[PDB]
RNA sequence: AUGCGA
C-alpha cells in the first residue's frame, strides 16, 4: 500500500511537472492518502463512493436511486456529517466557521 | 432597436361565442388618464412615450363588464412606431381582435456596450471620456476611440495597424 | 404538414430520407444584420450527428 | 430568514425506512378513488385527485385544514391499490429472496446452522467488532441436533462474550458502531452471503427441489418446471406464471420463519425498535397521494397542461377500477356458474389487467420500466443532470443577487466593487434599529426607496411589513419619527424594528465569476456605489484571479443578508485573504 | 446564508414523536378554540381510541372534515429548506421515509 | 504548514535582511507566556543527536519519532519538520560569516524567530483542505510514450484503473552494468513473436 | 406569546407533584406577589391577591 | 403482540394525581407544586439579567394561565435555575454559559423550576361565591379567581326558582353566597378556563 | 464530553475562522441590543463595534472547540491569543 | 430543447 501511495504521488507529480506546473505536494499527498484510506486503490468514482458512510453524499452524486435503495434496504441512519448531506437538511456546514460552537458567559448577579 | 408585439384576443378564443372583447371602454369608471396613452379607439397614439406600466391597449369584455388593458412590461421605455390592425385571413372577424404594435427602444452607446473592429478585437466601452480629457493631436482633434496597445501583441492583429494607416492616408 | 415540418424542422417519414437526424434541418434567417442574412445561405452543416461525436477528426 | 424568529429544535439526523399501509391509512388525509380530476367542467372532483382534502385550491380552502392556497401546507392522500404488486425499487431485492427460498419447507436452502453463523457475523458487524467477526469462523468441532445446537450455543456465547467485552470496554455502544471500514466489511459479507444464498440449487434444510424462477423484467415472475428425476427425488424425499399476491403470501411466511437472521440482515445497525421484518415492504398494497401543492398544472406563459403525475396516477386509478370491475365480475360470476368458461376472457382480463396495472405503477415510478416521450415519473424527476438534488438542492437560485457585465476602473480600491446606482437602490440589508443607528436609518427612510442610502421597507417587530415603494416624503417622514417606538406587546418587547436599507459604502458583497474553478474566483469586495454607472466595476488587480476580461465577461454579485455572512465576507473570503493561491502560493 | 437563508428557508412543522415533517397540519379551530398544531400520525381516531376499554381534556382536535382526533399535539417547527418538504413528496411515494430527529423527546 | 504561509518560511536570508521588521510583527514577549519554549527544543536536541547518529534507510536506528509526532507543533515552539529544522541549522552554519557581519543578531534569537514564524505559519484548525486540494488539482488541469494530461489524470484519480493504457516499469541498472550489457539485456527481455521472424509463407493447397 | 422568543420549546416535570399545604401555598403567594410588586401580568397578580384574600378568609 | 400498544395508551395517558378534599371538608388540593424542566429562549437584550430575562420572557406570561402539560393554571414559580452548559464549574459560579444558535444572536437554555399549578379533577367538591343566577346556570367564583358555572341541567330539578329572578334551594330557602359542588368538567379550550360544576353528585 | 480546563490541549491561538465567527455573532448581538461594554466612540457599524470589543477583549463569548470524538474545550476570548 | 455570449 505504501508503494502504491508513493507511486500515485510520483505519477501525478510527473503529470503536472510535464506542464511545468507547480503544485504543492501537500495536495497530491492528501489525495493519495484518501485513495488508499482502505488499504487499496480506491478510485473516486461511484464505486469507491459506495463505501463512504454518508448516504446523502452517495445520493447526491450519481445513481441516486441505487444509493437510495441500498440505504433504505439497510434501514440506514444518516448521521448528517457530509457537507452535501448537511446542506440537504439546511444545517450549518461543519467545515470552517461551523467546525465549532460559540457560547456566552453571562453574569449571574 | 425595434421590438414587435402581437396583441391577439383569440390567440386561444373559441369562435363566435367567445368573441366579446373590443378595444375601447364601456364602464366610464376606468381612469381617464389612460387617454394620456390610448386613443378613444383603444389603441395607443403612434409616437407615444411608454414606460413599463403604461397601457398598451384597452378593450372590453361583456362577461366581465370591465375596461381591461394589456400592460407594457419592460425594463426600459419605448415609443410606438406602428400599430397595424389585422382582420386578415379572417372569414369576418370584424371586431378587430388582432393588433400588431411595434415598440421603438433607443439604444445610446453606453459603458459596457460591445464594440469591435473588422479584426475580431472586441471590447466593451469602459467609460465615456470627456472630450476635454481626451488627448488632442497637434492637428487639433481628439480621437473617437482609444484602444490599448497591449491588446495587439497577443492577437497579432496587425491588419488593424495597416487599416489605421490606410484609412488615415485615404481620408487625407 | 410542410408548414409544421418547415416550422420545427423535425422531418420524419417512413424511410427517414436516409438522413442521420430528424431535427435541425431548418434555421431562422435572423435578419439582424445583412451580413447574417447573406451568410445563412452560404452556410453548410456537416450535420448534428457529427456534432454529437466526441472526436475532432 | 429573520434573526427575529429563532428556532431551537434542529434536526440532528435522518432515519430512512419503509412506510406501511396501516401507517399510510392512518396518516392519510383521504382515500382517492375517483379517476376523475375536474368536475362541472371547472370544479375539483369529489374524492378525486383534486379533492380539497389534499390542500387548498381555486380559493377553495384545503378541506383538511381550511387553509388558503397561500397558507395550507397541504396533506397527503392515499390509494388502496386493488392488488399488492411489487415495489420496483426493491424488485431486484425481492426477486433475489424469491430465488433464495425453499418452496416445500419455506426455509433458506442454505444450512440452518450456516445461516445462524451468518447472523452471528452480521451481529458482530452491527457493533463493528471485525476482529471478533473473523475470529468467529474458528469455532469448530451427519451432524447431531445436539451438535448443531451446540454450534448455535457456542456462537451465541461468542456473540454474548464479544458484546459484553466491547460494551464493557466502550469499544462500541448500544447505538452500534459505524465507520467506512465497517460499512465495507458489511457489504462484502452481505455479498458473499447472497452468493451462498443463491448457490444452493436445491434446498438443504428440507432437501426439496425448488423450481427455477424466471422473470419478465419488471412485472412478472414465472416458476419453472422440474425434472422427473428431481420430482421423483422429491417424492423419495417425500413457464408457470405467478401473481404478485402469491409471492406476497409466500414471502410473508418465509420472511417470518427467517426473521432471526434477517433482523441483522436488514439492519446495518442494531434495530432498537424491535421492528419485525415484513415481506409487505417490497410490495405496494396501497399507493399514497402527494400534496396538491406539488401537483399544480404546468402553465407555460398561457398554456395550461395537466400534470403528468395526474396522468399516470389517473391511469393507475382507471386500471384499478377496471380490475375492480373484474371483481364486479366475481360478484357477478362465482355464485357457481359451473361450466361458464365465459370467464376465460375475464381471465385474460385478470392476466392482462394485472400485468397492466403493475406496469403502470412501474411507469409512474420509472418511465424506463413501462411499455414516445412518456411523461417522467419520480425516478426521472429525481435523477440525471437535474436530480432534483443537483438542480435545486446542491445548487439553487438565490435572492439579493445581481448579474452584470464588468467594467474596469483603476480609481477604486483593489478590494472594492463599483456598484451601479440601480443596484445601490435595489439591494437592501435588514438593519435592526438601535440607539446608535437611529439617525442613519431615520435619514435613509426619509430618503425613501427612490434615493441613495434611504431604505425600501420597514419590518415591524410585530412581524408585519410596511413597503415604502409608494409612500410620500410626508408618510416616510412620519415613519422616521416612529422607528424608535416603545414596546407594545410582551410578545414583541425583546425585538426592535427593522429597516431594509439600500446597499451602501459600508457593506461587503460576495463577487463570483462563473469559472468558480477555484475558491479564489469568488471573493468578498467592499461595495463602492459609483454614480452614473450601469456595469459592475472591478479593479484590474483581481482579473487574474477570476480569469476575467472586459471583452464581455459577466459577473454575479451576491449580497449577504447576515452579520455572520458579512463578518465572513470581510474576514475570511475577502480579496486580501486571497493574495496567494493554495495551489502553489504564488501571488495571483 | 446563500444556499438557504436567501433562497427557500422555511420554518416547517415536524412531529417530535414520529420524526416526519409532512404529517403535520393545523388543527381546526372553534368559536372557543384557537388553531393548534397537530401531527396526523400521532393521533387516534375518535371512533376507536380504545373507546371499548376507555380523556385528558385537551387531546381532541378536529379536521376540516369534522373528524375528531386524540393526541397529535406534540409537533414543533424547525428551520429547513422547502425542497426538503419536496422530498417527502417523491420519497414518501417511494415507500420510504425521513425520520427527522431533533431535541430529545 | 499552510501553503499560503510557506513561501518565505524557507527564505532565511530575506528574513534576516528584514529581521527587525519580523521581530516587530511576531514579537514573542506577548506570547512566551502562553506556551512552552523548551520541551520541543529539548526533544529537538536529543533527536538531533540521534539523527546525526543515523544521518541505510531500512536499517537505521528507529526509536525516535519526529518532533511533530510527539508535541503539538502549535504549542511547543520548536516542533518542526526535520527537513525544515535541518535546512535552518544548515543555513545558520553556512552563514556564520554573515553572522560575523550583522549588527548583532544571533542564531539563537534568529533561530527563535524562525521557529516562531513556523508556529505562526501553521494551518488553522478547521481548514477546508479537502476542497482546497480538489481545486488545486482541478483548476490548473484546465491549462492542459505514456499517457499525459487530462486522460492520465483521469486514468489515476477518476477510475483508479487496474489496466493502465501504457503500463511501464522502470529498471535501474547497476553502476557496474555496461551500456553494451544493457543493450544485450534490452534484447534479452523483449518479447519476440514468431511472426516477427517470418519472411515469406507459401501455401500450396493441392486437392 | 406564540413563538420561541416568547414560549418555551419544551417543558417537562422531574418529579410527581407535591401537595403544598395551605400554609405553604400562602407563604409562596405572599413571597411571589410581594417580590413581584416591588405589564399586564400585574392584573393577574391582582387576581393572585384575590386568591391570597380568599386563602386569607374574606373577599 | 397486541398489548404493547394498550400499554402505550394506558401508560401514556395515565394521570399523575387525584387531589383530595382537604380534611375531607374543604376543597381538593388541586393546587400542587411540581418541579419541571423547561427549554426557553434568551434574547440578547437580557444578557445582563438572564434569570430575569427568562422570567420576563416566558415565566411571567405563564402565571394565571392554563398549561396543558402541567394540567392547570400556573399559580406561580419557585426556584429558577439555569442549567450550565459547562461542567467543571461546581454549581455556584459568578457567570453561567449557554449555547448560542449557529444562525442568530439568540440563546437557548435549559431551566429547572418548581411550578405552583391549580390542577382540578372531576369529582372534586368545591365551594364558590355565587356570581350570577340565570335560569340555566349559577355563576360562582372559586377563591376569587376561577370562574365556575353550574347549568340548570346539571342542577337537581328539586331546586326552586324565585323570579334573572333567583333560585331557591331544595330545602325551601333561596340560595345565597357559597355553593358546594362536584367537578364534572373543566373547559380550557376557550380564551380562559371554565370549570364545569355539578349539584347532582 | 467535558474536557477539563487543566487538560485543554488545543492551539493557544484564535484561528481566523474562530475570530470570524466571534466577530460576526457578537456584532449581531450588539445590533440586536446586546449591552455594549465599550465606548461606542461614534461608530454606527455593529461589526466595527464588535471589532473594538475584540480589541479590548471585553467580548463575553466562549469558543467551544469540538474534537471529532465529541469532546470539546471551552476557551474564553480573554485567553485565546487573538492574533 | 436550438442557437448563441463569456
Ligand atoms: Zn390543508
Ligand atoms: Zn427448504
Ligand atoms: Zn407524528
Residue numbers in the entry:
A (entry chain A): 1555 to 1663
B (entry chain B): 803 to 974
C (entry chain B): 460 to 516
D (entry chain A): 1 to 141, 172 to 268, 312 to 444, 450 to 666
E (entry chain B): 1090 to 1143, 1146 to 1196
F (entry chain A): 1055 to 1109, 1112 to 1200, 1214 to 1276
G (entry chain D): 12 to 49, 80 to 100
H (entry chain G): 8 to 170, 214 to 251
What does the paper say about this structure?
The large ribosomal RNA precursor (pre-rRNA) is transcribed by Pol I, accounting for up to 60% of total cellular RNA synthesis in Saccharomyces cerevisiae. Yeast Pol I transcription initiation is regulated by four general transcription factors: the regulatory factor Rrn3, the Core Factor, the TATA-box Binding Protein (TBP), and the Upstream Activation Factor (UAF). In addition to recruiting Pol I/Rrn3 to the ribosomal DNA (rDNA) promoter, Core Factor has also been implicated in transcription bubble opening. To gain insight into Core Factor’s role during Pol I transcription initiation, we obtained a Pol I Initial Transcribing Complex (ITC) and determined its structure to near-atomic resolution using cryo-EM.
